[PDB]
Amino acid sequence: AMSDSVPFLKQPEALDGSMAGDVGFDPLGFSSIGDINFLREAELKHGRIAMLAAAGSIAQDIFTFPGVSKVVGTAKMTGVHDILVKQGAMGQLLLWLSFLEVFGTIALLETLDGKRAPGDFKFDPLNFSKNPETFKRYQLAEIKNGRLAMMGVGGMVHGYFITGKGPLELLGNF
Amino acid sequence: AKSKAVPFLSQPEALDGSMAGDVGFDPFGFSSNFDLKWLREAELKHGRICMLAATGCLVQEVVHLPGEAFSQKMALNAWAAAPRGGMISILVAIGLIELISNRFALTATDMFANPNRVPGDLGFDPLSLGGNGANRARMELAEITHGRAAMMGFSGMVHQMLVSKQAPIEQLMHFKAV
Amino acid sequence: LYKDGKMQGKGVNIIPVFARPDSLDGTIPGDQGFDPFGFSSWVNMKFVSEAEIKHGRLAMLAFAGIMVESIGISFPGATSILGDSKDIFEIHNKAVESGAMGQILLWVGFIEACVGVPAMNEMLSGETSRMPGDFGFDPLGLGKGDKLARKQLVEVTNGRLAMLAVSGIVHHTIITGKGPL
């Protein structure tokens, strides 16, 4: 009846072990306040956006698309944001992500009703998880990599705020 | 038989530990002359306004809306410098929130006429964070403790802004004795 | 060994000019019959026991740090930014201005808030049957059956002695201007 991750603390009652990545880690009792379905949807959304942002920071350090260097110049990481607000790219990005997030809102409220798993958009066009066990293995890997990429992208953007190098440039220059 | 907060006084009647934050602290006998439902509703309302007010007095120094009219770090200057039509809109909106949120029962003779109406229970739970039974009493205790601390703090900040003519955080950083 | 009735338990008083109160149960480690002001009659004993243990462990770490930093042992490169002197107060101020002690404050507060606050609240509320000072931390495996005492009593006694030692050392550093040893 005790938390596995923090052995001197009780097992949270909203945690059960069914969800991928459940090690009984909720010491401050956030699952006692919010719904666990809302919390899992928020965790998956933060993690997926952070994986995309981490991979984006790495690849934009590595290379650039044709023509972006003329419009942007020698501006990198969050420094491009304002420039790409003056250009039309991020308005298009926000428009289509808002269009997707309208149906995301409907899906989240459907999950809060209780007919749909949090973060289950049934988007598997390559049919990777045929048998359920590999599905469990990808679920655990997805939640672990999402949390890891949350921490990683936080470190990357705050290291950019400190030195203005970039996640690979800071590695390549102390 | 004695009050727990004030051990040299007898326990005030109608106070039996049922409400949150009840330590038997009523030396002037307000609960012996007025009903506890109105007193609790008033205490929660003053406390919630002071929670928002203390958070405003701290936040407005660090964060401002764009524009010249919202650039006063000291809140008593921001009361005057803000556009007047906006504050009159704020007054009218607070009046409407009072009018509909209490369901047209606004006075000392018609609020709590419905037996289901609970002190401080306006039905306000936008994200439904109260859907858990054993958290509830601790939640009301935390809410009233935050409200009481915010009342005392906001009183202290307003009158210290009156003494010092300084916004609170930079008054703590640029302190000048009286 | 627990030595109930010799070092702890009912009937033991190390300062017999102040009589042992009836309030002390004898279950708590370090109960040696010293409560002249009768605080045990009205305070919650678990909370103040955990507070005594945590203050004691903080004072042990403070004594060890003060002695190794006033004698002259330093990490590589640690002398440069924090000054090549030995005075603990100036070491505090230089390491604050460097930003090291803010980083220490952030992580110690994160540890305090994340598991310490829930442990104290659930321990006091009666939801885990957790003992005071029990954070389940035994990496090297040194107490298994000797945990009853010869670990608890010696830790609380050294904690109190470390509190007195650190207080003495600090006020000597204040009055003399030179660190110990």
Next chain:
Amino acid sequence: AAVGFSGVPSQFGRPESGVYPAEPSEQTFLGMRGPRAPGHRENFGGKHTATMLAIAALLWQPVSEAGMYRMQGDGSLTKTSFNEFEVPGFGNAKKVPTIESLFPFSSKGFDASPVLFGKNSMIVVEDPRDGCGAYANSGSCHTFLDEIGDALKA
């Protein structure tokens, strides 16, 4: 018999209502708990409210950047107000109310954006600590702790 501030109209001799509805437990995201008609929380519950807030936030994005954008010879864009959009067939009213009439950002000098904070309407954040410390400051920084320390050291 009649406690002060009791709030019961029968206790004060005030005209009562008699009809007191029971309080249901159903909750709406941006609404209020209370008695409603049958069918109300099922058509206009949390799902509907969140969907309409999402749709309103989506439709805000073209509305915030409202204007006639016209390409020039060099491929650049010139944004000009809908107030100059003229119509052929409503008599002497060539200028007509438009979407910018309902959302007049430029009339107030408000640089609207699709997330409603603009470049010329950015939230202003400034550090109140003035780049000094909590204690042991020599300069234009005299904190409360420094005042305490000087009060003991005099």
